[PDB]
């Protein structure tokens, strides 16, 4: 069993909580408390390896908690999530990446760019621009739908694979 510490970041309403709950518990959730920042644990098999995922589903917080501080110190990879129908959430991505680099004091932090809500045919964010933003960063771009489940495992499993790539290097 190998432990991986992941952190899910992104603007309010992009689907961080929905993605986390769909991954862990197999439910699509319409209204999960937007203020709750909680940690979840799931045992999954990825490429034949038994992985223990510790996932921080982040939220807007007024105080900097002991739980958040554990992930600040030992979090290994980040999912930077935007919604394909919210331009402002895509514009925040570069700020999330810049901040993660400073938090970890590293130009090489395992990260995946996630474009959520791809079940909606209405796209305000050009997915070609997202794939080019990810290419510019040297990271994978994954499309997801917490509603249909498409890409959900792919987003988190790709992040675990990026962490492995970082550990071996």
């Amino acid at each position: 069993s190998t432990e991986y510490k992941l952190v899910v970041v992104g603007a309010d309403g992009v689907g961080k909580s929905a993605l986390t709950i769909q991954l862990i518990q197999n439910h699509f959730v319409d209204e999960y408390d937007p203020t709750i920042e909680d940690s979840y644990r799931k045992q999954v098999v990825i490429d034949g390896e038994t992985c223990l995922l510790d996932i921080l589903d982040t939220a807007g917080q007024e105080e900097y908690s002991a739980m958040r501080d554990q992930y600040m110190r030992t979090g290994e990879g980040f999912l930077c999530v935007f919604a394909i129908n919210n331009t402002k959430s895509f514009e925040d991505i570069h700020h999330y990446r810049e901040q993660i680099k400073r938090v970890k004091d590293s130009e090489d932090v395992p990260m995946v760019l996630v474009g959520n809500k791809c079940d909606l045919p209405s796209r305000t964010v050009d997915t070609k621009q997202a794939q080019d933003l990810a290419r510019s960063y040297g990271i994978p771009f994954i499309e997801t739908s917490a509603k249909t489940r498409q890409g959900v495992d792919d987003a988190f499993y790709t992040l675990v694979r990026e962490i492995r790539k970082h550990k071996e290097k």
Binding site: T58, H95, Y96
Partner: peptide, 11 residues
């Protein structure tokens, strides 16, 4: 106060 925001409240 580590920014850009990004996540609020990271110091």
């Amino acid at each position: 106060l580590i920014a850009x925001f990004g996540f609020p409240x990271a110091x």
